[PDB]
Write a protein that binds this ligand. Structure first.
Ligand SMILES: [Zn+2]
Length: 47
């Protein structure tokens, strides 16, 4: 099987550590200090 999406409209903020996407600035910093540098630092091995 297989499924996904080829292409995507640019955005103002988009995490690079994993590739997260956002529309606002605060929305970006959050994820940065929510899961990445937040609780359980050693767990997920996403790309
Ligand atoms: Zn991230």
């Amino acid at each position: 099987g297989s499924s996904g999406s080829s292409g995507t409209g640019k955005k103002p903020y988009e995490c690079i550590e994993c590739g997260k996407a956002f529309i606002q600035n605060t929305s970006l910093i959050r994820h940065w200090r929510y899961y990445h540098t937040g609780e359980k630092p050693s767990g997920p091995s996403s790309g």
